[PDB]
Design a protein around this nucleic acid. Structure first.
Lengths: 127, 137, 146
RNA sequence: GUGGGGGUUGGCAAGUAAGUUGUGGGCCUAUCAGCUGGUAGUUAGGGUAAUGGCCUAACUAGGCGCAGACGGGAUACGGGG
RNA sequence: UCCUUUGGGGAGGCGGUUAUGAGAAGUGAUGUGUGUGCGAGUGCAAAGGGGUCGCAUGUGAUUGGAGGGCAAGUCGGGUGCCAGCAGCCGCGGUAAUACCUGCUCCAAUAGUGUCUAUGGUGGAUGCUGCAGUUAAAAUGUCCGUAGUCUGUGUAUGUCUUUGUGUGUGAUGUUUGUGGUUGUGUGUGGAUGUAGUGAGUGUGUGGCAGAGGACGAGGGGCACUGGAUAGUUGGGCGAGAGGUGAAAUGCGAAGACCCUGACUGGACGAGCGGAAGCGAAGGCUGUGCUCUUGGACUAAUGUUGCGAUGAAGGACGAAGGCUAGAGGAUCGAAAUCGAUUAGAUACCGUUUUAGUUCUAGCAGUAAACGAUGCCGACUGGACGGGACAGUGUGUGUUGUCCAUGAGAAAUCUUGAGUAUGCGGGUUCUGGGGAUAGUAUGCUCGCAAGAGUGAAACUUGAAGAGAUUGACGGAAGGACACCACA
RNA sequence: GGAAGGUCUGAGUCCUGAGUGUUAGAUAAGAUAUAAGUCGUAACAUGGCUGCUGUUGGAGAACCAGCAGCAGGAUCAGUAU
């Protein structure tokens, strides 16, 4: 989760400069679960990663649609009744944005966690 | 600030709080040690002398005060007699009730060194004698 | 990001992805094994064995000929040193500083080196005791300062 | 019980009450850092309505501590509120 | 109402007294008194009260303010830096919108002001969520244990156990604070399900070893260069030295200057730089020797052995102190001569401790880039130093321009990466002054260092920049009230 | 305990030793607010000897001198035959 926060600062830097692609010289397993949840929601075009028997590599394809992404350290523990307070602190409006949690069913955003009756540890957000 | 670090944060933030002066008098239990009337809001006293004090410049004046004796603790204090021509109702060996000024234990205005204020004179309000509602003692 | 200095250099080797077995070998595979096991008996340290294999035999990765690493091969053949090479180089460096300081007392430069060299040796010893490679009561054998 | 020796009618089960005991919690303070002799334990007996150093005899050398012991201070009855 | 239910009960009930809080009505009105008094009935153990009727009857506002903050007067008359007012800023010296007195108006109203404690105000204690180049604040430098972080304690269904409070429905005590009455919620535990499967293999950070180079990094030994001073041979014949100008002081027992020989301590010029090395303090003659560092280059070994760091430890300019050695130059203290109104000073003469080396103590600096450590990411231009390659790369480093940031000056491997606020882990600050002062304790031969208050006082103290005024400030022009 | 007495619990009296507060004292060193002053002029301009930090000696008083350091300076800089 030190690799998750490093990735979000490098994405904010390129999305502000108008880049199309981003190459990072590292790649972890839960860094790739966070990126697969931005792809199915429409915020990036795609990505791909290389195997080199070093720390890994990853290439992100940006879109033009991202306003910001972040990570929360440390990963607090939130019951299913406390999901909704973390949403009013992190997203600008009530109609868009996604807060992601690491639950006992995988990685879900805050709309799914309410339709499955679970809580977990917070990872990050993006809008 | 890890998730298992709450004993390091209570230890650290309690020590920073002592740098606040108002909090430090309460936490160490020494808020009423050096105080001429302790925990009372008003106090009685008997009048020894009747003096006049200069205003602090740039103001020209002479403010009328009295030297008293606190009946409860035997400490000497000076107090200020507010209104116009009102220092002449009191005599010596009179009893008087004094109270604060209202600014946390500092002096107010151009009056140097005085932290108290005469309120009554032998159980009669001093402000009512000046407006004509009551009669002098 | 070095341990005891602010150095940030990046030099060093990079081994290939997915090597193979050498065809250009001149000797036999069984004639090479009996020589890696000979040099281990003369007390040659394992980082220096791999430098002879590379420079004189054509073996770039000995895990493709011996079937495993160098110091696991020597172990099955009954050659297990009393202390590993990492730890014993550091005892030896800390003895040559201690006996220079016995003749030249005013060398304040070497007295500072002795502190850093020797706290690096107690950190490496603590690792081999957690891992059960030396006894729990091992002490370094040291020249005695005067 | 192949002798004898005690007691003077006092019970059972529910209900109600009471005693004893384990762990856990933000008053302030390091110009308070080392503390402890029935003190930590074992074995026997006494006492108790009842477990237990609760108490005694003999023997072992233990027990607590920067995750704050042992001390000292301020207008300290604890909760529901 | 209960205990002991016609016995007992200062438990408990009933009034009275009191600006304790909270709620609800009044102080009038034109068609036809919201008050007070009395009379019936009701009520109670006996009575007050209250509400259902009638009879007369007619009464009932204050407290704090009017210069700004802050709603409301340059209205009359008095006083003249007086008397007084004013939480804060401020007013008053014969021209008071601020004091005293009279009118008029403003806010709330059976209430409205004052003194004291406390929540908010305060992102001015900061978990969310502050600041630390110059405003208060990163510690002189490395090493390092506990702890934190990294490497290899969760959610939820069902059941159970506990609140007098409270969230939220219903219900015309005439309305209301209320009362009655439906439903939800607070802490621990038991038993299932899900995450959840486990060490393996690989070698990404570090460490250890290899190769050829680079460096005023350190200790020791042996030599060397000239200048200052002095001793001693030869020459000369009256002043030399230093100052704004001179005086004390030195010179015919021959100074100063020029020459042949020697002795001694200290120092290492020029080359010498926005060049190198060391943890920092610091380090420039030559040759030997024992030790040392970082970078680079690579199909070597190992396999996470790591980051930060109260407690502990070592090192640390100059001055000072303790013992021995040494003594060229300079020089506190002392002393005379000048200058001056006076100079115990600046300038000078005579003369010391000290300045050097060896062995130690001590522990401070504008010990400064006034700028924690580690990790991720980011435009150009011209350079330097080392290594390796061949048209480039890695580690370091100087100058100049954007973007971005900032209170600005300014910053460019950071003082950048959004109040769009969370990468790991420490320290220090919380208006000024009292004061780094008292007192206790630890260390020192001492000189002192480290840690570190309060009473009392006070409305600003401070940062960066703007326009003026001034300088016993620097330039460029000028002029017979300036020179030639 | 037949008694003389023994045992347990133990207030109180008399004496010594720490602690934690509060307070009187001849003399006497500071701090702060004043008045109304006396003596000088250390700092701010190259403030008339540039200024400041540490250390050690000295003076009626500000302060002065020696050794090293800093610019928050009065210099971001000047022609190698």
């Amino acid at each position: 989760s030190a690799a998750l926060a490093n990735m979000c600062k490098a994405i904010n830097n390129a999305s502000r400069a108008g880049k199309r692609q981003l190459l990072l010289r590292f790649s972890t397993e839960e860094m790739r679960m966070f990126l697969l949840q931005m792809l199915r929601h429409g915020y990036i075009s795609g990505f791909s990663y290389i195997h080199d028997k070093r720390s890994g590599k990853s290439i992100i394809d940006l879109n033009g649609r991202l306003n910001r992404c972040g990570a929360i350290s440390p990963n607090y523990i939130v019951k299913r009744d406390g999901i909704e307070d973390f949403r009013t602190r992190l997203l600008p409006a009530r109609q868009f944005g996604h807060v992601l949690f690491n639950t006992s069913k995988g990685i879900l955003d805050h709309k799914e966690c309410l339709t499955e009756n679970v809580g977990g540890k917070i990872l990050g957000y993006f809008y | 600030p890890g998730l298992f670090s709450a004993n390091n944060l209570i230890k650290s933030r309690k020590a920073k709080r002592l740098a606040d002066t108002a909090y430090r008098k309460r936490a160490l239990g020494t808020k009423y040690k050096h105080s001429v009337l302790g925990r009372a809001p008003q106090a009685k006293a008997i009048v020894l002398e009747k003096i006049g004090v200069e205003a602090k410049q740039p103001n020209s004046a002479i403010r009328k005060a009295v030297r008293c004796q606190l009946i409860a603790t035997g400490k000497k204090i000076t107090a200020f007699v507010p209104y116009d021509g009102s220092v002449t109702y009191i005599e010596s060996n009179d009893e008087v009730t004094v109270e604060g000024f209202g600014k946390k234990g500092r002096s107010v205005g151009d009056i140097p060194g005085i932290r108290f204020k005469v309120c009554k004179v032998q159980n009669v309000s001093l402000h009512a004698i000046f407006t004509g509602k009551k009669e002098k003692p | 990001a070095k341990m005891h200095s602010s150095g940030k250099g990046r030099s060093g080797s990079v081994k290939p992805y997915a090597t193979a077995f050498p065809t250009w070998l001149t000797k036999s595979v069984d004639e090479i094994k009996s020589d890696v096991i000979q040099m281990g008996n003369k007390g040659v340290p394992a980082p220096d064995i791999g430098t002879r294999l590379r420079d004189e035999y054509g073996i770039g990765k000995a895990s493709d000929v011996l079937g495993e690493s160098i110091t696991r091969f020597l172990q099955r053949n009954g050659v297990v040193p009393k202390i590993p090479h990492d730890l014993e180089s550091l005892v030896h460096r800390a003895n040559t500083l201690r006996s220079h300081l016995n003749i030249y007392r005013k060398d304040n430069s070497a007295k500072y080196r002795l502190i850093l060299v020797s706290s690096r040796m107690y950190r490496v010893a603590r690792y081999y005791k957690r891992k059960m490679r030396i006894p729990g009561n091992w002490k370094p054998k040291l020249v005695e300062l005067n």
